[PDB]
Amino acid sequence: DKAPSLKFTAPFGCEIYTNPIRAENCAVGSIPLAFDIPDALFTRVSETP
Amino acid sequence: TLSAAECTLNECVYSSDFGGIATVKYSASKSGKCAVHVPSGTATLKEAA
């Protein structure tokens, strides 16, 4: 008697894997992304439609 | 002799170089050359004709 593993009881629908011990696709929180785009990639308005 | 001309600023950035394009719709009497010029100091024209 050991109860179901974390594969079946982890909140947010995490997938529990081993080697290495990890959780996957936990639908909690948000990742704040920060982009640094150099000025070269910004073309002119006349070039785009 | 020019007639029915309208200027649209389809692009402008106040940069040191020629950072602006003006498109003029024209209905001229005949083909030829115009001495395009801005009497005011608001803008500097890349082309004198």
Swiss-Prot record, chain A:
It is a single-pass type I membrane protein. N-glycosylated. It comes from the Viruses. It is found in: Virion membrane; Host cell membrane. Disulfide bonds join 14-26. Interacts with spike glycoprotein E2. The precursor of protein E3/E2 and E1 form a heterodimer shortly after synthesis. Processing of the precursor of protein E3/E2 into E2 and E3 results in a heterodimer of the spike glycoproteins E2 and E1. Spike at virion surface are constituted of three E2-E1 heterodimers. After target cell attachment and endocytosis, E1 change conformation to form homotrimers. Interacts with 6K protein. Interacts (via fusion peptide loop) with host LDLRAD3 (via domain LDL-receptor class A 1); this interaction mediates viral entry to the host cell. Class II viral fusion protein. Fusion activity is inactive as long as E1 is bound to E2 in mature virion. After virus attachment to cell receptor LDLRAD3 and endocytosis, acidification of the endosome induce dissociation of E1/E2 heterodimer and concomitant trimerization of the E1 subunits. This E1 trimer is fusion active, and promotes release of viral nucleocapsid in cytoplasm after endosome and viral membrane fusion. Efficient fusion requires the presence of cholesterol and sphingolipid in the target membrane. This is Spike glycoprotein E1.
